[PDB]
Amino acid sequence: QFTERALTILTLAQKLASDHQHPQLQPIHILAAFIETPEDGSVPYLQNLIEKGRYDYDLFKKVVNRNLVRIPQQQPAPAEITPSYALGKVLQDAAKIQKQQKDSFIAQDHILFALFNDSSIQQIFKEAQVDIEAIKQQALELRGNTRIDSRGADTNTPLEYLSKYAIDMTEQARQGKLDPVIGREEEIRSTIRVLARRIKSNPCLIGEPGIGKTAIIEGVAQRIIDDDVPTILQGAKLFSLDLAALTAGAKYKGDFEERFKGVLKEIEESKTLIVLFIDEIHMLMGNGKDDAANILKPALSRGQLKVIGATTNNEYRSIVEKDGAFERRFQKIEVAEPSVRQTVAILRGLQPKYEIHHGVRILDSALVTAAQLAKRYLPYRRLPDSALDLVDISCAGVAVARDSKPEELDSKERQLQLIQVEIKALERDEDADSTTKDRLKLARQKEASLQEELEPLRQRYNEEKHGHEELTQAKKKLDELENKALDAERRYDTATAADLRYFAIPDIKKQIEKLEDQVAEEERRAGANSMIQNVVDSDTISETAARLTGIPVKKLSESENEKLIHMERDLSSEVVGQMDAIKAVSNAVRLSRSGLANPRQPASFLFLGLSGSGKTELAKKVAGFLFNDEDMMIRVDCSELSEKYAVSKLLGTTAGYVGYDEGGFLTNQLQYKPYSVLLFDEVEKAHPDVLTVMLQMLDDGRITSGQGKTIDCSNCIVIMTS
Amino acid sequence: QFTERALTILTLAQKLASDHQHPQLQPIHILAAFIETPEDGSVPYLQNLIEKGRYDYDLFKKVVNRNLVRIPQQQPAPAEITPSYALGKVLQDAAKIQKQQKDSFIAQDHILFALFNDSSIQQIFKEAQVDIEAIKQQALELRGNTRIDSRGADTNTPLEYLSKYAIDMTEQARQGKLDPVIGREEEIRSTIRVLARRIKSNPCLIGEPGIGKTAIIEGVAQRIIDDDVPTILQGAKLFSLDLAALTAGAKYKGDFEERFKGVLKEIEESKTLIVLFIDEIHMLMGNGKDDAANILKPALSRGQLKVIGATTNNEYRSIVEKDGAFERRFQKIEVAEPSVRQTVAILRGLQPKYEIHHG
Amino acid sequence: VRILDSALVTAAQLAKRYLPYRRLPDSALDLVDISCAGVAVARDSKPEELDSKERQLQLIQVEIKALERDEDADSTTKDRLKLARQKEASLQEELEPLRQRYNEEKHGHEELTQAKKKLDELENKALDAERRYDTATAADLRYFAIPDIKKQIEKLEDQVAEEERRAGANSMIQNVVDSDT
């Protein structure tokens, strides 16, 4: 037969009769001719009959095909369509042409097997459909043993070919539709080799999200897409995926497995090298496991079936929990996060490429510092984003501050309402040539000019904004000269390697020069940029960071080292007490900023002695130097230190016991409390095993939770005192 | 006095019948039988109101539409006017003449297809058979109350679904409706960024209810409709609906989805830039958690053209706990509630209006 | 990839003793990967010489055509393009043997692997029934098939075409030192 899904392309028969109905129409026509496409029909546009399908290239058969079934006899809504003589037309011809494809039921492209003697509008080779070679032959030529679960594309073999929702690689940034990147390239490449590395080849390690590890895969794909590849790796494709029409199936199972298992089969067949990394099921499965592949691919790894993993380590270890063949098939790649130092060039590179988002210009550097300075201040975040985060945020606040150009606007909010008000009241008053107030009518001189000379400011603040528009907006185009070219070299093009490099190089630098050179100067503010139409981080961050955090204003600056000196030398001024402590303390800060100090671990320091006293300001006043929320510090009681561990600070329940809020206490705090000190009862009385445990963790300024999550920001101090 | 859109795409096809030629002639009806497509609705397409004769959603066999172009005149464009001999303007009275249905007058199928057996001159052919049907394309054209008094393309000119089952969003302001309640502008004025920002632009402010859940967007829309954006709102507009298009209904299943097919393309029709939330969390969330606008939302993150605002908080965290699954790639927060006097002031401002309502 | 492999072997025990928690031989097997990993490392596209030297020769072939058109390039101007074409030719020529050196060796080495592999087919196809006390059905095709393939082997195995570049070959160890892997 044809299929269960035959509705669509099969629906157009009564649609062909749709002029008026029909006592029946005929298998000379149907919307399956057009199928879902308005030219040649899926198959005889592309799918089956595109190249080889004989007649009806685009409008060939379908253009005039409707002549047969148009209009009824008398049909208000009596009837629609029916094959009649065509009823048995494909009946055996639907199930005959299948042979053994590794398939299930009757085929519409199987019904496309033998076509028909004459049912159609066309002359090609016969009275049958299209011309020749299509359907069962074309499909068999063009494919095999694959249609759809119980059904498929309506009338016609089926336009459906690849796995429904794909997320491109090859052609993805083939257009540069994604970005250049730097990152872990070899570090990556290392993997990427090993992505081949045979027998067990995929990475099946990775640390933790957020940073472009995705974006890696692409930069991965890059040299891959650069198609300079290990031949064994040479070809490939992925779409590293999630989800589907999946919830689509109501209450059914593996709606994935539905497309998915066929997707396997999609991928199963040959298609040369095509890489099947999906993404997250690692995170998935678990409980309420869906076994997308998780049972099957492990076997269905089968012949050369290639999927290359991405995830969080503890999340990963969260399957070290599940374990199993999660051992096998599974391999080892870390991740990292770099130094801002490392980071900037990235930060550098495409921020302009980004910038165009805001169509502004960028400042240079301290940004990044200030960003890293910032990075210190919202550190839960990934490194790179942070920029991006601030960046656009900056750019935003900028764009707010700037792109919204709300300088004149607030003026022109007030000053267009300050233009015509005071006008009519300044002309008259009782004392004219007498002296009581002799400035009386001076108040109209620049008043008439208030919004009036804001028109020059409308001019200016647009003028050199178009002096800034010329600056940025010309580039963004002129950007795409060298931009597209680098992607336009795509064939090893000397048409690209000369022409648009010419069209670049003569044009670019000149027009590059022009724009800042078309920024002359300004007397009110710096240079012809009126809004200044650029970005000063410090500024840009200040509020930002504020509107991130809190009153910087000291943090309107960094010296801190002198502050080290002075706040210290002044800790008196805020303490007046045991001074030498301050030193060692501050020395520890010097240490804290030594870093020539052993990187390991924040300072130890004293037990002080007694309580309820400067100890407490002592206890407090610390970040009063530093981070100046001494709200901060965490606490413990030696009392709380039992003779077994529950202790919910850290650890607590980790494996299989009751609750995972257990032990997060500090962590999640520490997580979002990357800087503090702790408290314990004098730290003194603490339970001995704890004392180990505490010092156990207290020692080693690099650790990870008893729940298995990184400990020791180690920058952050504790010193507890007894 | 009305239409010139539905009619403009129905009886106004005389202007499309000749660029300059045949002031009164019907060599070209239905935009002169060259226009648009059979896509959403407009232009030469499958049919005018309802046409079952030829392939649906398609203008002309071989080339799409473009039929009877360049009639037998030179440039007699504004002689006076008339299609179909002298009945062209009267062709705007035939939408109810055969009247399978579209509406009384001013319809694409109304004006042009108003001729039963007549369009301009072929016999009468765009998409149709005889008359009294108004069904084949008509229903498929979302006609049958597809007519409305707001400027639009009736039965041909527009195609509106998500657009039809829908809420104003955008215009709710330019047509005055509610006023400003001043307030958290600066917040929105902050959040104003959150709109234009590259990623995570999705702005849920999960603070106060009522006015204060409401009044925000509103003023936003105000501070939108003022149209002072550097960029986007110029080319951007907005959407919020909860069971607010077609059916909250229980008919069978997938009502959400059912509503979503609009939601699906909903922006991709790419009119302006349409980005906005309808409010609610669980609605944001879905049935328990379900995909409704939800698990599919990433595609819409992939579709961009986002949504915005939230609720009162906690269930934020709740889902944010339940998952930030996108919300991790969401970005926003809010503040909660201001104080007395400045409020009293805005109330001092808000004073007259509903008082004035009472006067 | 051939390697002398001896020390490489001995690397195991070490490498073994280095992360031996993993299953010693098959972990040692892991090395065998890691080896070819380290080789595939060396490999990438190509083995490792030009894909490295792609840093120069090809980026000097970028010098060959990168600057091909800027404002003006004729005789005396700021445009430095052409001069790379004079030199890299001979260099980029050697790529071709260098290319071959693994490739044409791989070409040969293709069969090499294939050779007894297919014997391990064919002599299994000999062994097809040899274990039933079946004999000649095998020997039938197996006649000369041993002393032809193996002869080709014998022929081709002997084939070096090095200057004498490294050993008896062209690029097989590709230049790959175990120790360094």
Ligand SMILES: Nc1ncnc2c1ncn2[C@@H]1O[C@H](COP(=O)(O)OP(=O)(O)OP(O)(O)=S)[C@@H](O)[C@H]1O
């Ligand atoms: N040189 C670079 N140019 C552009 N992007 C870069 C560069 N180096 C790193 N990236 C990353 O590209 C990323 C794009 O978004 P990402 O989400 O981080 O990709 P991803 O983070 O791996 O996906 P997840 O879920 O975030 S892990 C940014 O987060 C950057 O960290």
